[PDB]
Amino acid sequence: QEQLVESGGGVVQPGGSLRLSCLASGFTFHKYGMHWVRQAPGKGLEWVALISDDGMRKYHSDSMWGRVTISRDNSKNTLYLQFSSLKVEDTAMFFCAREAGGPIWHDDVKYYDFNDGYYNYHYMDVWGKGTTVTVSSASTKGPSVFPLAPSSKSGGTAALGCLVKDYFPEPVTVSWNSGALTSGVHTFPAVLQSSGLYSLSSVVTVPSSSLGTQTYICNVNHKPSNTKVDKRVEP
Amino acid sequence: ALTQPASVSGSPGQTITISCNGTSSDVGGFDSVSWYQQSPGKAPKVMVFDVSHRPSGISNRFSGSKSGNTASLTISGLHIEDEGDYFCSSLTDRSHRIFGGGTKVTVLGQPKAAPSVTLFPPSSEELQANKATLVCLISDFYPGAVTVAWKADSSPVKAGVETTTPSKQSNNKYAASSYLSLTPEQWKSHKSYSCQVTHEGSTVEKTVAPT
Numbered sequence: 001q002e003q004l005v006e007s008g009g010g011v012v013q014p015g016g017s018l019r020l021s022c023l024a025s026g027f028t029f030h031k032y033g034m035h036w037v038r039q040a041p042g043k044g045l046e047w048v049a050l051i052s053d054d055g056m057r058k059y060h061s062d063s064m065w066g067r068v069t070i071s072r073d074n075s076k077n078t079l080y081l082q083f084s085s086l087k088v089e090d091t092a093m094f095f096c097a098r099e100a101g102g103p104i105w106h107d108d109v110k111y112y113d114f115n116d117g118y119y120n121y122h123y124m125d126v127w128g129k130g131t132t133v134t135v136s137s138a139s140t141k142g143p144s145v146f147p148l149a150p151s152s153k154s155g156g157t158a159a160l161g162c163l164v165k166d167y168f169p170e171p172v173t174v175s176w177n178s179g180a181l182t183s184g185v186h187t188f189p190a191v192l193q194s195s196g197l198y199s200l201s202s203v204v205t206v207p208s209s210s211l212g213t214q215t216y217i218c219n220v221n222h223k224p225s226n227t228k229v230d231k232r233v234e235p
Numbered sequence: 236a237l238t239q240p241a242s243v244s245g246s247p248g249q250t251i252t253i254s255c256n257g258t259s260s261d262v263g264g265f266d267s268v269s270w271y272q273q274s275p276g277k278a279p280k281v282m283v284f285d286v287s288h289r290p291s292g293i294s295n296r297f298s299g300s301k302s303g304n305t306a307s308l309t310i311s312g313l314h315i316e317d318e319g320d321y322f323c324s325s326l327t328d329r330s331h332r333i334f335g336g337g338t339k340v341t342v343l344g345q346p347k348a349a350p351s352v353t354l355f356p357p358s359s360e361e362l363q364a365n366k367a368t369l370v371c372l373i374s375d376f377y378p379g380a381v382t383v384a385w386k387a388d389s390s391p392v393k394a395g396v397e398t399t400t401p402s403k404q405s406n407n408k409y410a411a412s413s414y415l416s417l418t419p420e421q422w423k424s425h426k427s428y429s430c431q432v433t434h435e436g437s438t439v440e441k442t443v444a445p446t
């Protein structure tokens with residue numbers, strides 16, 4: 001039934017041009033308005049553009065600085081968005097969303113506009129899982145591994161881990177003492193810093209008693225760059 | 236951007252209300268407010284539109300209102316399946332659409348757990364590499380919503396701060412990481428630096444000193 005599919009996504013160069021494509025089905029395409037909504041990683045929704053049913057009217061976000069252009073091909077039931085001079089901050093999820101709409105009634109009779117086209121309604125009733133877009137130029141690179149040593153604060157339980165920073169692309173696998181260490185182990189999700197390179201952190205909780213009597217070694221494997229590293233973390 | 240609280244929590248069966256403060260150029264200028272629910276790893280869903288109206292096939296527990304420049308979303312009798320992020324959106328006098336920051340709604344499924352926070356200074360090694368990065372790591376907190384605030388000495392710091400989205404552990408609690416990149420100089424100039432995570436009204440605080 002009513003469905004939208006987002007496609008044309010991937011990883012792209014800054015300053016380059018890109019063009020996304022949404023495909024609908026299960027409804028009369030040429031009767032509704034269409035939206036693009038973006039969502040940077042872990043951020044909130046952000047409005048991008050709105051195009052009228054016949055595509056002879058367009059609206060863009062004032063914060064897009066006119067770097068985006070929205071278009072449509074009603075004969076293909078397909079919606080388009082296009083970029084220019086992309087930026088790393090343009091990393092986000094790109095949703096396709098229909099604009100609710102239909103007749104408007106006064107008394108018991110319903111009125112349309114010329115052509116019998118729907119008046120607009122003001123709420124995106126249909127969504128399609130967005131396609132993802134990543135902006136980074138950094139060729140494949142190996143990660144640097146820095147020790148996060150146990151603070152002097154701890155008796156009780158101590159925390160220590162590895163700061164694996166400056167790699168590309170994902171993913172990276174992080175073990176401890178060669179897998180032997182599992183409990184109290186939390187490996188965090190990677191962040192894409194301004195650099196255009198990835199960073200992450202894995203940490204392990206231990207009894208402060210074990211400090212100096214137990215050797216902790218984080219094993220990092222960055223398959224892409226074919227790099228394996230071993231770092232000892234100590235007070 | 237519209238203003239929503241970062242997070243609201245409650246128990247099942249309990250009733251809740253998310254606020255959405257705005258201006259006279261949107262919320263207060265039009266009765267076209269919509270509410271969207273976004274459950275993890277999924278796509279938004281319309282819950283309310285034109286302030287109070289419920290689309291066909293939407294629970295009687297979702298209520299919406301408005302007052303001046305501030306509209307609301309009221310969930311009566313929280314079910315677990317209500318969990319997820321919620322966004323308010325309004326029409327604007329520029330014929331644009333605007334979204335709120337979003338509100339993570341948590342319905343308790345396991346007894347509350349205060350976070351365990353640790354703060355790392357830059358390693359000597361990174362500092363020989365002419366760089367600096369304070370790692371602030373948070374674990375074992377439930378609900379899965381926290382507020383990370385950095386402070387240089389006494390004053391707050393927003394620039395160069397990165398924070399990941401809370402994720403589930405093996406023990407079903409939540410963890411999050413926050414980085415604060417610095418130059419070797421900035422790091423040497425200040426007395427100290429403060430990492431402040433706010434979780435369920437309570438705030439823990441650790442502090443690294445370059446000294």
Ligand SMILES: *[C@@H]1O[C@H](CO)[C@@H](O[C@@H]2O[C@H](CO)[C@@H](O[C@@H]3O[C@H](CO)[C@@H](O)[C@H](O)[C@@H]3O)[C@H](O)[C@H]2NC(C)=O)[C@H](O)[C@H]1NC(C)=O
Binds near residue numbers: 238254256
């Ligand atoms: C939009 O949301 C903001 C927060 O994001 C709301 O701020 C707070 O609103 C209350 C209600 O006016 C203010 O007064 C409160 O009174 C109750 C008792 O009636 C008390 O328990 C609270 O401690 C508080 O004193 C509160 O000061 C205010 N906080 C602010 C201003 O930051 C606000 O209600 C919303 N918008 C507007 C215009 O009120």
